[PDB]
Amino acid sequence: STIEEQAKTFLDKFNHEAEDLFYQSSLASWNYNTNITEENVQNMNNAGDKWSAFLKEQSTLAQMYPLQEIQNLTVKLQLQALQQNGSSVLSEDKSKRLNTILNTMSTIYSTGKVCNPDNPQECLLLEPGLNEIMANSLDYNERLWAWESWRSEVGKQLRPLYEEYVVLKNEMARANHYEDYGDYWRGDYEVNGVDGYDYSRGQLIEDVEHTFEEIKPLYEHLHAYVRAKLMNAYPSYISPIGCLPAHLLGDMWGRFWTNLYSLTVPFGQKPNIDVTDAMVDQAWDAQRIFKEAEKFFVSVGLPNMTQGFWENSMLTDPGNVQKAVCHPTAWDLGKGDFRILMCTKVTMDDFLTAHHEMGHIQYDMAYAAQPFLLRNGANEGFHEAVGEIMSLSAATPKHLKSIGLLSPDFQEDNETEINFLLKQALTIVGTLPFTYMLEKWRWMVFKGEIPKDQWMKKWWEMKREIVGVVEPVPHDETYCDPASLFHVSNDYSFIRYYTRTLYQFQFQEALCQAAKHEGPLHKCDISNSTEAGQKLFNMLRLGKSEPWTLALENVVGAKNMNVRPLLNYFEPLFTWLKDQNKNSFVGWSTDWSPYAD
Numbered sequence: 001s002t003i004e005e006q007a008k009t010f011l012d013k014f015n016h017e018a019e020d021l022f023y024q025s026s027l028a029s030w031n032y033n034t035n036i037t038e039e040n041v042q043n044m045n046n047a048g049d050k051w052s053a054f055l056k057e058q059s060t061l062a063q064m065y066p067l068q069e070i071q072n073l074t075v076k077l078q079l080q081a082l083q084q085n086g087s088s089v090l091s092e093d094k095s096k097r098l099n100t101i102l103n104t105m106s107t108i109y110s111t112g113k114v115c116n117p118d119n120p121q122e123c124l125l126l127e128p129g130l131n132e133i134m135a136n137s138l139d140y141n142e143r144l145w146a147w148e149s150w151r152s153e154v155g156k157q158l159r160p161l162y163e164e165y166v167v168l169k170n171e172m173a174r175a176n177h178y179e180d181y182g183d184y185w186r187g188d189y190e191v192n193g194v195d196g197y198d199y200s201r202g203q204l205i206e207d208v209e210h211t212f213e214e215i216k217p218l219y220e221h222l223h224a225y226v227r228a229k230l231m232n233a234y235p236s237y238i239s240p241i242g243c244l245p246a247h248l249l250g251d252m253w254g255r256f257w258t259n260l261y262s263l264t265v266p267f268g269q270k271p272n273i274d275v276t277d278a279m280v281d282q283a284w285d286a287q288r289i290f291k292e293a294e295k296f297f298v299s300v301g302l303p304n305m306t307q308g309f310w311e312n313s314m315l316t317d318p319g320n321v322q323k324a325v326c327h328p329t330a331w332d333l334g335k336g337d338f339r340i341l342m343c344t345k346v347t348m349d350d351f352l353t354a355h356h357e358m359g360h361i362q363y364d365m366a367y368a369a370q371p372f373l374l375r376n377g378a379n380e381g382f383h384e385a386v387g388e389i390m391s392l393s394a395a396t397p398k399h400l401k402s403i404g405l406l407s408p409d410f411q412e413d414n415e416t417e418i419n420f421l422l423k424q425a426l427t428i429v430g431t432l433p434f435t436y437m438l439e440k441w442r443w444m445v446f447k448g449e450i451p452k453d454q455w456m457k458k459w460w461e462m463k464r465e466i467v468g469v470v471e472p473v474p475h476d477e478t479y480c481d482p483a484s485l486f487h488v489s490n491d492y493s494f495i496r497y498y499t500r501t502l503y504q505f506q507f508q509e510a511l512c513q514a515a516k517h518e519g520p521l522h523k524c525d526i527s528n529s530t531e532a533g534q535k536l537f538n539m540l541r542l543g544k545s546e547p548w549t550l551a552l553e554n555v556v557g558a559k560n561m562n563v564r565p566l567l568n569y570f571e572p573l574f575t576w577l578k579d580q581n582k583n584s585f586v587g588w589s590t591d592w593s594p595y596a597d
Contacts, residue, residue: 003065003066003070004069004070004071004072007065007070007075007079010062010065011079011371014058014082015371015372017054018058018372019334019335020335021050021051021054022051023334023337024047025044025047025048025050025051026333027047028043028044028046028047029044030331030333030339030341031043033325033326034314034318034322034324034341035322035324036322036325056088059082060088062083065079067079067080074374074545077374077544077545078371078374081373082373085175085176086172087172089171089172089175090168090171094168094171097164098168098169098172101161101164101165101168102490102491104161105161105165105490105491106490108158108489109154109484109486109489109490112126112153113125113153114130114149114150116145122145130146130150131251133146134146134250134251134252135250135251135259136262138233140247140248144472146252147246147247147252147472148473150252150484151480151484154484155484156478156480158480158483158489159478159479162483163452166445169181169446170446172184180443180446180447180448181446182447186201186443187201188379188380189204189379189548191547191548191549194547197547197550199549207560207561211561211562212432212433212436212466214567215429215563215566218425218429218567218574219432220586220587221581221586222429222577223243223244223588224585224586225577225580225584226244227240227584227585228240228581229264230263230264237594238594239592240584240585241588242588242592243464243468243470243588244468244470245469245471245472245594246463246469246472247472252484253485254434255434256431257427257430257431258427264422264426266415266418267415267419270416270419273395273406273420274348275348275405275406276346276347278405278406279347282405284346285346286315286344287315289344289346289350289351289354290354290358293355293394294358296358296390296393296399297358297390299528299529300526300527300536301530301533302362305365306337306365308337309337309338309361312333312337312339313331313339313340314326314339314342316344317343324341324343326341326343328341328356328357329341329357330357330358330360330361332361332364332375334372336368338364342354342357352391352394352395353391355390355391355394356388356390356391357387359386359387359388359391360383360386363387366537366540366543367541367542367543367545370542370543370544373544374544374545376543376544377544378542378544378546378547379499380493380496380499381496381500382503384496384497385500385501385503385504388504389508389511392508393524393525393526395424396523396525397410397412397416397523398523398525399525402527417522420522421572422573424522425570428501429570431501432501432502433466434467435494435495435497437462437463437466438482438485439493439495440462440466441462442494452477455477456480456481456482457477459481464590470592470593472595474593474595503552505565505566505568505569506558506561506562507555508524508565508569509521509556510555510556511526511536511555512525512526512532514531515531515532516529520571520572522569522572535555536555538554539551542554
């Protein structure tokens with residue numbers, strides 16, 4: 001007859017009512033992704049608005065239950081994420097303005113078209129269009145045109161809408177008892193009420209800017225090497241003392257740096273690793289790729305997947321008769337139903353993608369017993385962190401040799417491991433400072449460290465301060481360059497893509513030491529060792545029921561988040577760079593600019 005028992009029965013009624021409508025709402029979404037149809041575009045809308053109304057009404061009926069007089073930390077964990085008013089605190093007109101701004105941001109970015117009024121042939125789409133010329137072009141102006149002009153038609157029309165977004169989200173957060181919306185976004189990592197494990201939202205910056213203080217060395221040699229060797233590509237434009245132009249970072253912006261490898265190979269005469277020539281000869285299909293990826297998880301002790309998983313997942317493009325957006329996504333429909341979406345093809349990268357998205361499915365399989373609010377990762381960067389460590393063990397030549405794909409007598413030397421390390425670090429570390437600078441800018445603008453008149457000046461300063469990237473052409477206040485990214489335009493959280501990597505190496509190191517590997521960490525494998533899989537499962541089975549510090553402790557043993565596994569993983573590459581960069585300019589100087597004439 002007290003608050004703690006009334007909260008439990010209310011949560012029982014909520015979870016026994018949230019689960020079944022969540023299934024109904026996600027089924028329509030999956031049916032729309034499989035079948036892009038007008039009849040389906042409204043079905044998921046009806047279903048999603050029903051569940052949106054459900055969560056709002058349950059949030060309202062949960063708001064008479066104080067958090068101070070409930071002691072059970074489980075019930076408190078359920079209540080703290082359900083009590084969140086979010087958009088409920090603002091007026092109807094402000095809610096209308098925010099949602100029109102929301103569906104305008106996505107619309108303008110998605111339907112942004114580039115064209116040349118002087119040359120009709122210079123008109124192309126984004127995928128597989130505009131990114132392609134930013135993908136495989138070796139000319140400077142070729143990338144320059146669709147770099148500056150990309151933000152000419154979309155990088156101007158979101159500046160005032162985002163200016164209004166900043167101010168309305170400030171009240172979005174302040175009315176909910178936060179300092180800023182930057183303080184609302186850093187709220188997932190907040191842990192309170194756990195003695196010794198209590199984590200505050202203000203400590204996130206204190207830890208992130210400290211962890212970057214040990215990542216800066218490796219990155220400055222990466223930048224020094226890349227700038228030293230791109231003068232073989234662009235000798236007449238780029239200084240080997242200054243920094244790099246933004247249009248040569250691999251994509252329209254430069255988040256991922258996979259695209260530089262084909263031009264920045266360490267050794268060219270060696271034969272790079274690939275089975276793409278191996279499944280064509282040996283008759284592997286999407287079924288068999290998944291079946292062999294399953295054995296990876298079976299070896300470490302993880303249970304076999306559901307019978308319905310195979311009969312409900314989508315594996316191969318259903319021809320031209322039906323058009324399905326098949327971005328690689330893992331789907332947890334609940335009620336024991338889980339599916340995966342990807343247009344599978346016969347290539348090694350699709351094998352790594354299959355493993356990466358298969359880890360997500362297995363991880364979500366682990367916490368089925370958790371309630372419908374605890375059926376999520378402890379932190380946001382934790383869900384994509386459990387899914388890539390399989391991929392790091394899926395690219396090891398030892399792994400490919402035991403399955404009969406890779407040649408049994410491939411010689412592995414100091415030139416093969418090192419090129420593998422360049423391929424991975426240029427991809428997994430080339431993204432960390434860019435994620436950090438982006439979220440740091442979001443935090444100083446959302447706390448209001450900047451006025452209007454230097455909104456983007458102090459943006460290119462931190463690109464030229466953190467990642468060391470100069471602009472080919474100066475930008476005045478009129479545009480909006482940060483908004484060009486999809487995650488900024490639709491306003492997601494991004495530091496999940498800096499913190500996921502740093503969980504990745506901690507987990508990999510702890511796991512393959514628990515597997516008793518003798519040798520450098522960059523090749524250690526997790527298969528055929530149940531003692532590490534059982535340790536990992538005892539972590540995956542908690543999910544959100546425990547604080548992320550304790551979740552890190554039960555595996556790695558540290559409540560802190562560390563870079564030491566990162567430096568162990570890239571120590572051999574670090575060593576190559578030291579004696580490779582004896583004559584290059586370690587570091588950068590801010591005075592340099594390509595247009596400083």
